[PDB]
Amino acid sequence: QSVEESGGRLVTPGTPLTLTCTVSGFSLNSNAISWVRQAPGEGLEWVGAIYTHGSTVYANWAKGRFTISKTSTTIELKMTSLTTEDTATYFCARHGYTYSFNLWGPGTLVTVSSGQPKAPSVFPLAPCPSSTVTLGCLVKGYLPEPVTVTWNSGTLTNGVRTFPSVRQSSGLYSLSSVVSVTPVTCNVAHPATNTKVDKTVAP
Amino acid sequence: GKGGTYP
Amino acid sequence: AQGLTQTPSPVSAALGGTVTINCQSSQSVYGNNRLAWYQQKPGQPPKRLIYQASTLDSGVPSRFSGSGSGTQFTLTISGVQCDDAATYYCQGGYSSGDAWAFGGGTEVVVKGDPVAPTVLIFPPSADLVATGTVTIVCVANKYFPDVTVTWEVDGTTQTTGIENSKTPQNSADCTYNLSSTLTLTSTQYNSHKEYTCKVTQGTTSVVQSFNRGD
């Protein structure tokens, strides 16, 4: 039993867009669904809900910019009058009979910005020797977020440290990942552009 | 219809 | 319409200590007990801990307890673990106004065992210099408590062009990791010799330096 959000992307202010929540292993005829948004570094904000009979309710703050609708397997969230202030992760959540949420998706990211999508550029981090060395990848110049960073296709996981992203003046993002090892490859995915970069890091 | 089948 | 407020952030305790998180609602929740608590770590969806004020969700450790009713609710954590470093959100159900509403959250910081950082500095790769923009990466690894980072270029303290990014507390040992990046033009980078990252924890400092093209 699961829910999963899709449709998060980079849009310019004033561009309308539709997110989709896809449900698995339960009926929307017996289970209500909410949309919940979270701006980067900020709190969970209830957007609204669609009840079993198709009725909808919205948070006071929505002010008619959000419309929720459903089919048998999906719930859509349609959003309008987006400004940069609407940049946020959007979750869908299944209602429990306890009037709390019992199932969440991973979230999908709406980025409201000037700028065009950009794939990351990956550069090795190596010291200017022991048996053990810390090496890394610098991941820079990407938009929108996120990237994922794995090592040797996920076979190297111990002591991997991946830092939170930073937005440069250009509006592009940057982060680093480092790992201690005894040849290592960092695997960077940018789902927004379907881009997969592999960088072998030579000591 | 504002709940669900599970707690 | 209705307003939810929580214990200000951060709430700190020593590993094995006690944490209290309060939640106040301007309006009584539905049936005086429709209040749930969620745990959330950066990048992850919230996880429900408690529903109907006091019922633990499936598999939630017993060190978590919800109590209260009407307009006043409390989440406690006894024997707080590094794993419990997180943001905690209360959520009410209401018969009137916004049907669902979250409090603003309370961050819990767990004071684990002190660990002095180990520090690494990484010069820009030749292909990065060739882009015309240089990033120098300094890392402070597996430390607690918090550090400050200072840079120098050719012995002059460098306070501009720096960004610091700290990981969340390690779920096993409460430790942080930190990246400090200095960003310069290749022109600036090639006009200077000595690049120095200094990481200070209390009165202790660890310095890592390189000379461009060593």
Numbering used by the authors:
A (entry chain H): 1 to 128, 133 to 186, 191 to 211
B (entry chain P): 8 to 14
C (entry chain L): 1 to 214
From the paper:
To elucidate how functional methylsite-specific antibodies recognize the antigens and lead to the development of a novel method to create such antibodies, we use an immunized library paired with phage display to create rabbit monoclonal antibodies recognizing trimethylated Lys260 of MAP3K2 as a representative substrate. MAP3K2 is methylated by the oncogenic methyltransferase SMYD3, and methylation of Lys260 has been linked to functional regulation of this kinase. By studying the local environment surrounding the methylated lysine residues, we found that the four antibody clones examined recognize the methylated lysine residue by using several aromatic residues in a cooperative manner. The pockets formed with the aromatic residues, termed “aromatic cage,” are also observed in reader proteins working in the recognition of histone modifications and an antimethylated histone antibody, which specifically recognize methylated lysine residues.
Antibodies F9 and E6 engage the peptide predominantly using their heavy chain, with the methylated lysine pointing toward the light chain. These similar binding modes could be expected, as the heavy chain CDRs of F9 and E6 differ by only a single amino acid in CDRs H1 and H2. F9 and E6 each engaged in 17 hydrogen bonds and 4 salt bridges with the methylated peptide. Of importance, F9 and E6 engaged in several hydrogen bonds as well as salt bridges with the peptide’s C-terminal carboxyl group, which may explain why these Fabs cannot recognize the full-length protein. The results show that the binding response of the amidated peptide was nearly abolished for F9 and E6, whereas in contrast C9 and D6 recognized the amidated peptide with comparable affinity with that of the nonamidated peptide. This demonstrates that the major reason that F9 and E6 do not recognize protein antigen is their bonding to the C-terminal carboxyl group, which would be incompatible with binding in the context of the full protein sequence. Two off-target bands appeared on staining with F9, neither of which corresponds to the expected size of MAP3K2 and the intensity of which is not dependent on SMYD3 expression. This result indicates that F9 does not appear to recognize protein antigen. The RMSD plots indicate that the methylated lysine residue was stably bound by the aromatic cage in C9, E6, and D6, whereas it dynamically moved in the F9 complex. Of importance, the F9 structure showed that the methylated lysine was completely thrown out from the cage at several time points during the simulations, and the antibody retained the peptide only through interaction with the C terminus.
